[PDB]
């Protein structure tokens, strides 16, 4: 029975490989052969947000594109006013081990997660002017790698249990459990229509799930090492993956097989975070070369390099209006990068 | 020009900066010890007696006006290489090895010796790229179990290349030397080896001495003398 089941599973895998090969009539490379190149993009550190006293591990942009949230191992979740460098809030975390943070779309809550296997939802808007622990979602038995709010009451958290979980904040219970990854999921991105979410794991694969059905809609592979980063295309029908292998691969949801891979002979380290631009033309990935690189998604040619940190670029984020690029690194610094006319 | 409450928000940011720097100076004053090891290898009893009466378990204890944070990660069952970099910067790694585990085999797989698994874990954690200089306080636990286990069973099962004379002293010395042999980057990392005294108190005293030595070495490196 087990041999027969394994053989038929291999047969279906072969069938889907054949389908992917048949649908790959011509990759994205040739169709963008005559596309005007992006050009040399040069960027300036318009503002440096200092005040952290340990390695910054995560950073999420507010929906207003001005408020920022940064998490570091010192045990403090700092909310910055990026426009004026003012530090709005400094929430003291119960556990100093944090590797993910999120800004709720309404801005009323911030998520914090780490090696405590607990997602702490902090309520910013209170009658008393101190941020309090609104909720402590627990049930994961592995480290939380990424958290993303949906509608101020549902949050999706990917853990080290090779599982993601949809949490109803009010009840504090796990509405749906997304299982199927062989390795522990390291990043999590949400589609703009909040209908689906894609998460990549250490099994060198990224799975696309429906949030309400609770089952793995699609699975994408092609990487050789763990997926440390994931990011949705603003169209909502594509997503990019960064891995320990120095490659960023773009898979679209309608055609499972990958479209392009971005790599160079120079860079050997691992991608830590990936974020797209608003137009989707630029894909900004942090690396372990103590700097981040801006790739052109359509032509797979390195557009630029933002060499401004003395340690690993751990978190990358792009404002919802595409006016800034926050890059938080292990040197306890966040740099907001922008272009110059 | 700055608005009235824009100025007030700047002052609030300054106050938050003052609190941040005070908290950071308090945190840099404490000793962050990363405690990891094989399961049931005396980890629980070690944290017990040096408490002096899932996720990471944080244990706070003070000895001779020195704050100590202990970070147990045994609950985590995921790939450690995905989060071990979070501990880059610990003062020391308190490794715990069951000295009596030189005969018992792993429950999950019977083809791997438990002491061999501990040796593999020690090799992985000492030679990790994130701990090229962090010292290691190695604790050979279950000393009294080994004291009676040796006169029945020999080291040959655990280590075939063993001379003989099956007594406590030479067997413990051999195990200690074998463990420190995994330390490839000598002269930059230290392995403070201690045989735990389950009936005594000096177990935390040894950790205090090792931490003081590592603090002195780090200070010398900061001043550039070394």
């Amino acid at each position, epitope marked *: 029975e087990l041999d027969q089941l394994r053989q038929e599973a291999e047969q279906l895998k072969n069938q889907i490989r054949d389908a992917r090969k048949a649908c790959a009539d011509a990759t994205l490379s040739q169709i963008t052969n005559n596309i005007d190149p992006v050009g040399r993009i040069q960027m300036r550190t318009r503002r440096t947000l200092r005040g952290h006293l340990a390695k910054i591990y995560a950073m999420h942009w507010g929906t207003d594109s001005r*408020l920022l949230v940064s998490a570091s191992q010192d045990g403090k979740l700092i909310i910055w006013d990026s426009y004026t460098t003012n530090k709005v809030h400094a929430i003291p975390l119960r556990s100093s081990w944090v590797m993910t943070c999120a800004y709720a779309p309404s801005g009323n809550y911030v998520a914090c997660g780490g090696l405590d296997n607990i997602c702490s939802i902090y309520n910013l808007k209170t009658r*008393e002017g101190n941020v309090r622990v609104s909720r402590e979602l627990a049930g994961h038995t592995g480290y939380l790698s990424c958290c993303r709010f949906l509608d101020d009451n549902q949050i999706v958290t990917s853990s080290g249990d090779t599982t993601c979980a949809l949490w109803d904040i009010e009840t504090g219970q796990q509405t749906t459990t997304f299982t199927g990854h062989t390795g522990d999921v390291m990043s999590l991105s949400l589609a703009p229509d909040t209908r689906l979410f894609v998460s990549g794991a250490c099994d060198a694969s990224a799975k696309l799930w429906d949030v309400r059905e609770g089952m793995c809609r699609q699975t994408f592979t092609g990487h050789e090492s763990d997926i440390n980063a994931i990011c949705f295309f603003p169209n909502g029908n594509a997503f990019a993956t960064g891995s320990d292998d120095a490659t960023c691969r773009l898979f679209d949801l309608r055609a499972d097989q990958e479209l392009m891979t971005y790599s160079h002979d120079n860079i050997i380290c691992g991608i830590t975070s990936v974020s797209f631009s608003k137009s989707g033309r630029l894909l900004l990935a942090g690396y372990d070369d103590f700097n981040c690189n801006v790739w052109d998604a359509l032509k797979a040619d390195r557009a630029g390099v933002l060499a401004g940190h003395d340690n690993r670029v751990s978190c990358l984020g792009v404002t919802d209006d595409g006016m800034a690029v926050a890059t938080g690194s292990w040197d306890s610094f966040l740099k907001i990068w922008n272009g110059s006319s | *020009t700055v608005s*009235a*409450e824009d100025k*007030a928000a700047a*002052e609030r940011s300054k106050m938050i900066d003052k609190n941040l720097r005070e908290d950071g100076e308090k945190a840099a004053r404490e000793v962050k010890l990363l405690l990891l090891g094989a399961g049931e290898s005396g980890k629980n009893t070690i944290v017990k007696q040096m408490k002096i009466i899932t996720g990471i378990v944080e244990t706070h204890f003070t000895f001779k006006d020195l704050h100590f944070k202990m970070f147990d990660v045994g609950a985590q069952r995921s790939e450690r290489k995905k989060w071990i970099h979070c501990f880059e910067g610990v003062t020391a790694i308190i490794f715990c090895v069951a000295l009596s585990a030189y005969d018992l085999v792993l429950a999950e797989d019977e083809e791997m010796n438990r002491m061999h698994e501990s040796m593999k874990l020690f090799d992985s954690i000492c030679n990790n790229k994130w701990f090229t200089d962090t010292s290691i306080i190695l604790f050979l636990n279950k000393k009294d179990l080994f004291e009676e286990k040796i006169t029945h069973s020999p080291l040959t099962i655990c280590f075939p290349e063993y001379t003989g004379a099956n007594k406590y002293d030479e067997a413990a010395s051999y195990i200690q030397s074998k463990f420190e042999d995994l330390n490839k980057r000598k002269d930059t990392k230290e392995i403070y080896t201690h045989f735990t005294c389950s009936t005594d108190t000096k177990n935390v005293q040894f950790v205090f001495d090792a931490v003081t030595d590592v603090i002195i070495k780090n200070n010398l490196k900061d001043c550039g003398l070394f």
Partner: single-chain antibody
Amino acid sequence: VQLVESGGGLVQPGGSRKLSCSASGFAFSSFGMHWVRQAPEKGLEWVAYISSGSGTIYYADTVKGRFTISRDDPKNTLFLQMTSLRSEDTAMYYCVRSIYYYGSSPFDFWGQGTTLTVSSSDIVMTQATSSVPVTPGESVSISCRSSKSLLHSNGNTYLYWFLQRPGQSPQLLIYRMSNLASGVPDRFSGSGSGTAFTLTISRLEAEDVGVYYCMQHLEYPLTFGAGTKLEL
């Protein structure tokens, strides 16, 4: 959230007194404290202010030097020591909390106040509307006017609207001239630009009766408006 007050009553002129606001139910240290006075039959006027941590202390020109405003965070108290009370110091005194950060709500909660009775550059706010008859269910508009433009270069306009229904302390309706307060109905709204601003009530309720004040926060000598009174 409670902001009760103590100390006051009948005092002789030229003497000394101390007003104590005993805050409870919220974080005293994070909030800035304001002392705002109201003449017995007239409108409000800003008196004093201390920031978080007592870093900056501001006074009105009328009460400069005679008054000293301080805070005791460990005991969660706000003190106003007043010396040489003239005839105009007889007033209704309020302590107001105001936390200042991006997106905050300054002047959110007001205390009951202390009644003090003694024996016998700045921006101006004009509310020429004064008293207006209102019928429940109708839509009314209250106009406020500023001496100079309050639109700072950062993009914010700096009115705060307060409603004082008869009998007790005022409450915040609109902050930053266009942002709805917390715990207040949706019908209230604010609009305008430049120097003439408006507050619109789509439907009038039984509890919307009372006086309305507009206050600026651009230049720290805060000046309240005359106050437009809506009655049935």
